[PDB]
């Protein structure tokens with residue numbers, strides 16, 4: 001019964017999976033699909049920029065966390081709650097979180113741990129929704145995300 005969680009996971013999972021594999025998911029979107037489609041298109045544009053600009057920082061974080069398997073992916077939300085909460089909440093920081101997700105998803109594909117990508121998307125979505133639900137609600141959720149970056 002948690003639409004914010006469901007929609008956020010759908011968007012984040014889609015972005016991480018396509019980033020890691022290079023393949024678009026042809027399956028139709030769930031509820032509020034038009035918005036989710038625009039949110040995904042927005043992440044492709046903004047998140048690809050973030051990944052280019054944040055390579056150094058993202059490599060630094062990946063080295064320190066040393067993520068190599070499902071056990072490391074399952075412990076990630078505890079670390080990322082700390083990292084993500086340690087700064088001003090805005091849409092930019094939220095994109096950075098998801099973009100770091102995509103960066104880690106690409107790494108997981110590289111080391112033949114592609115099966116960890118869905119658990120990673122869950123972890124990222126957990127961090128976002130658990131820490132920022134109230135903020136996301138006030139900022140009009142994914143409709144707000146799309147509008148902000150238009």
Ligand SMILES: COC(=O)[C@@H](Cc1ccccc1)NC(=O)c1cc(C)c(S(=O)(=O)Nc2cc(C(F)(F)F)ccc2Cl)s1
Pocket residue numbers: 046050054057058061080083084085087090091092093094095096097098100
């Ligand atoms: C305000 O929006 C920013 O300025 C974004 C870019 C941006 C600019 C314009 C449009 C969209 C985005 N950038 C940042 O918010 C950040 C960049 C760094 C390097 C940090 S950090 O120092 O806290 N490191 C760190 C933090 C996270 C996160 F997101 F979970 F908090 C994951 C991974 C890393 Cl390595 S936050």
